[PDB]
Amino acid sequence: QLPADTKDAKPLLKEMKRGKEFHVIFDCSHEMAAGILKQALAMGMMTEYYHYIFTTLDLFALDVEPYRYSGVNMTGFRILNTENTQVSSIIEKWSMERLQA
Amino acid sequence: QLPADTKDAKPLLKEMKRGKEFHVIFDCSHEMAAGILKQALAMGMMTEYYH
Ligand SMILES: *[C@@H]1O[C@H](CO)[C@@H](O)[C@H](O)[C@H]1NC(C)=O
Numbered sequence: 001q002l003p004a005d006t007k008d009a010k011p012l013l014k015e016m017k018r019g020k021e022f023h024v025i026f027d028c029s030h031e032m033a034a035g036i037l038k039q040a041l042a043m044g045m046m047t048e049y050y051h052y053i054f055t056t057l058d059l060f061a062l063d064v065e066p067y068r069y070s071g072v073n074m075t076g077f078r079i080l081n082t083e084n085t086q087v088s089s090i091i092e093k094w095s096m097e098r099l100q101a
Numbered sequence: 102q103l104p105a106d107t108k109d110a111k112p113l114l115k116e117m118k119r120g121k122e123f124h125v126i127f128d129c130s131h132e133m134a135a136g137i138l139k140q141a142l143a144m145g146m147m148t149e150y151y152h
Pocket residue numbers: 048049050051071072073
């Protein structure tokens with residue numbers, strides 16, 4: 001169980017590294033998934049050995065640029081049917097007004 | 102040999118990782134050491150193996 005604060009996730013990661021646990025099913029809102037993945041990266045917990053699975057339904061929204069060359073596997077799930085072009089147009093129109101925030 | 106530009110470092114590091122070479126003596130001004138270290142981190146070559 002990840003503790004109350006996120007950035008205190010380091011002890012868990014140390015324990016997992018010592019125990020040689022090479023498969024994980026994270027479970028949290030993608031916002032906290034990003035933090036735990038960054039903590040993993042700075043822990044050297046990110047190579048072609050480990051393989052993460054994210055029960056979050058927004059794994060696609062993460063920034064993946066710093067991670068994709070590492071050779072790590074991150075299988076997620078995505079319900080938002082973005083293959084249809086109509087959906088893509090709607091999403092783009094939505095982004096056209098999200099950037100006020 | 103490192104290539105001319107900094108971020109060209111990646112193809113070199115790919116072959117390093119493929120050949121299973123965990124002992125490296127770098128030789129460059131630290132201004133390049135920082136860049137090559139970031140590349141090595143994004144390439145995921147920063148574990149307890151490499152020295
Ligand atoms: C991890 O990803 C790489 C590239 O897709 C793949 O070749 C490998 O089979 C995957 N599994 C492991 C070893 O984690």
